[PDB]
């Protein structure tokens, strides 16, 4: 054990777990999931007295881990067991493909108006308990290269056309679960090469949500240190979940 020294003491014996997940999505214009995965890692900040034997239980088998490396200190068998380094370390990393919660449903609607205008409506639906708030929601609607200007209306958030980037960027500070927001935009088209079909790229999203999209949920983290005279009941334990978009594209 060259990852933890031997004489370690704390009045307040406390640990913190961060479940950090990136959820990736490619949805067809109809609503098929073409492809979707989650990449996750658990980080553990530990301030525990001695050299303790901890047992990390999640809800495996309940969700389905495709595969997952671990950290040195993990003894493989069959639940997860270790003597943690002190302070902060990555306990595990993992991937998931099955039974993924997709926190956001993006519903695009596009209408051509002769050769002068594109009419676009986009609806976002949040798909999770009303009690929880997504934050840092960024919707990105791409615009053709022949774009003279853009009008947008939206009741929630602020949106501005970014011509440098050829996209409308709609930002919402926070949104509750089980809700709907929409944006309307009118895109004014310069005339163009006549035989140029717009390769309509995907509408894409950014968000942070306070839960694991994988479905992963921490059930216990048990601390046993048999020398010293603090039991498990004495340890103060915290989780937080931070699920963030990776690639989260919906085809229009």
């Amino acid at each position: 054990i060259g990852w933890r020294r031997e004489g370690i003491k704390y009045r307040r014996n406390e640990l913190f777990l961060d479940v950090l997940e990136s959820v990736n999505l490619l949805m067809s214009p109809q609503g098929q999931v073409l492809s979707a995965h989650v990449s996750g890692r658990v980080v553990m900040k530990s301030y525990l007295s001695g050299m303790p034997e901890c047992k990390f239980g999640m809800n495996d088998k309940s969700i389905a881990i495709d595969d997952c490396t671990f950290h040195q200190c993990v003894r493989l068998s069959r639940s997860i067991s270790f003597i943690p380094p002190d302070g902060e370390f990555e306990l595990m990393r993992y991937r998931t493909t099955k039974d993924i919660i997709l926190p956001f449903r993006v519903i695009p609607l596009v209408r051509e108006v002769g050769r002068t205008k594109l009419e676009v409506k986009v609806v976002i639906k949040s798909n999770f308990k009303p009690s929880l708030l997504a934050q840092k929601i960024e919707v990105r609607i791409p615009t053709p290269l022949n774009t003279s200007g853009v009008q947008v209306i939206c009741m929630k958030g602020k949106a501005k056309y970014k011509a440098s980037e050829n996209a409308i960027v709609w930002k919402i500070k926070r949104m509750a679960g089980m809700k709907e927001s929409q944006i309307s935009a009118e895109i004014e088209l310069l005339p163009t090469n006549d035989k140029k079909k717009w390769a309509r790229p995907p509408i894409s999203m950014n968000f942070e949500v306070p839960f694991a999209p994988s479905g992963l949920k921490v059930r216990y983290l048990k601390v046993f240190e048999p020398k010293l005279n603090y039991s498990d009941h004495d340890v103060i334990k915290w989780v937080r979940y931070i699920g963030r978009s990776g690639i989260y594209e919906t085809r229009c």
Partner: peptide, 8 residues
């Protein structure tokens, strides 16, 4: 405004 909750 939150960050960090007890399990269950």
């Amino acid at each position: 405004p939150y960050s960090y909750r007890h399990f269950a």
